[PDB]
Scaffold this motif. Structure first.
Motif, PDB file in Angstrom:
ATOM      1  N   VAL A  64      -6.857  -1.563   1.590  1.00  0.00           N
ATOM      2  CA  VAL A  64      -6.155  -0.299   1.800  1.00  0.00           C
ATOM      3  C   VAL A  64      -6.894   0.685   2.696  1.00  0.00           C
ATOM      4  O   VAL A  64      -6.400   1.796   2.901  1.00  0.00           O
ATOM      5  CB  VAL A  64      -5.807   0.389   0.467  1.00  0.00           C
ATOM      6  N   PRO A  98       0.832  -1.217   0.000  1.00  0.00           N
ATOM      7  CA  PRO A  98       0.000   0.000   0.000  1.00  0.00           C
ATOM      8  C   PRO A  98       0.860   1.257   0.000  1.00  0.00           C
ATOM      9  O   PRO A  98       1.856   1.364   0.720  1.00  0.00           O
ATOM     10  CB  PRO A  98      -0.830  -0.129   1.284  1.00  0.00           C
ATOM     11  N   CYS A 147      -4.105  -3.565   6.480  1.00  0.00           N
ATOM     12  CA  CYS A 147      -3.742  -3.022   5.170  1.00  0.00           C
ATOM     13  C   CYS A 147      -2.663  -3.867   4.499  1.00  0.00           C
ATOM     14  O   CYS A 147      -1.761  -4.405   5.155  1.00  0.00           O
ATOM     15  CB  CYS A 147      -3.273  -1.567   5.295  1.00  0.00           C
ATOM     16  N   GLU A 184      -3.425   3.853  -4.536  1.00  0.00           N
ATOM     17  CA  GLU A 184      -2.962   3.371  -3.232  1.00  0.00           C
ATOM     18  C   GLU A 184      -2.187   2.059  -3.370  1.00  0.00           C
ATOM     19  O   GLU A 184      -1.846   1.408  -2.370  1.00  0.00           O
ATOM     20  CB  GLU A 184      -4.146   3.269  -2.250  1.00  0.00           C
ATOM     21  N   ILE A 185      -1.865   1.667  -4.595  1.00  0.00           N
ATOM     22  CA  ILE A 185      -0.966   0.554  -4.878  1.00  0.00           C
ATOM     23  C   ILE A 185       0.404   1.099  -5.277  1.00  0.00           C
ATOM     24  O   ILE A 185       0.513   1.913  -6.202  1.00  0.00           O
ATOM     25  CB  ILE A 185      -1.532  -0.329  -6.001  1.00  0.00           C
TER      26      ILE A 185
END
Length: 180
Positions: free
Chosen positions: A162, A38, A147, A71-72
């Protein structure tokens, strides 16, 4: 059960604990030396993986055409081990999934495998003040140290967890074009 076998095999063979200044996260190896984490882990030039320091050769914060975070973040690690190639199980497009599981292996949640139910394309949500795109959403009361956890079932690896709000969880969609 065969889902618990496919998913536990995934966790044992491809996943690792990544520790940053921002805490502990699950890291999912995808292929070769390329792993996903993340983006809000804020990985540096080297990362702590399973307690050991590992040099990051290259990292790519993944984004849509409008510069908004997925968010990757992809990590290319300086390691000899090649991850088992799981790209064949990663969907090509965003989509609803039934009977999905959340799985992680982290100090708060060791070898966790939890049934999350139905997962659906949900779009853009602001996570902790930051716009985030291509989210999938599930009706399960996730917790923060989860997460990086994988959202999957037998043969289908579709997101990493995430974010959440006590009622619902948000998964960043895993799309095969990220890893070609």
């Amino acid at each position: 059960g065969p889902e618990h076998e496919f998913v536990r095999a995934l966790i044992k063979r491809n996943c690792h604990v990544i520790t940053t200044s921002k805490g502990e996260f699950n890291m999912l190896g995808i292929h070769d030396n390329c792993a996903v984490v993340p983006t809000h882990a804020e990985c540096g030039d080297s990362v702590t993986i399973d307690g050991r320091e590992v040099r990051v050769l290259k990292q790519c914060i993944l984004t849509d055409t409008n510069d908004t975070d997925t968010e990757i973040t992809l990590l290319w690690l300086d390691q000899n081990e090649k991850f088992r190639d799981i790209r064949r199980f990663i969907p090509e497009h965003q989509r609803e999934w039934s009977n999905m599981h959340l799985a992680t292996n982290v100090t708060k949640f060791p070898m966790l495998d939890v049934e999350v139910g139905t997962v659906i394309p949900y779009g853009e949500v602001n996570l902790s003040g930051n716009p985030t795109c291509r989210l999938l959403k599930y009706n399960y009361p996730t917790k923060p140290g989860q997460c990086g956890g994988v959202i999957a079932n037998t043969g289908n690896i579709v997101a990493i967890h995430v974010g959440g709000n006590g009622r619902v969880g948000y998964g960043a969609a895993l799309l095969r074009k990220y890893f070609a």
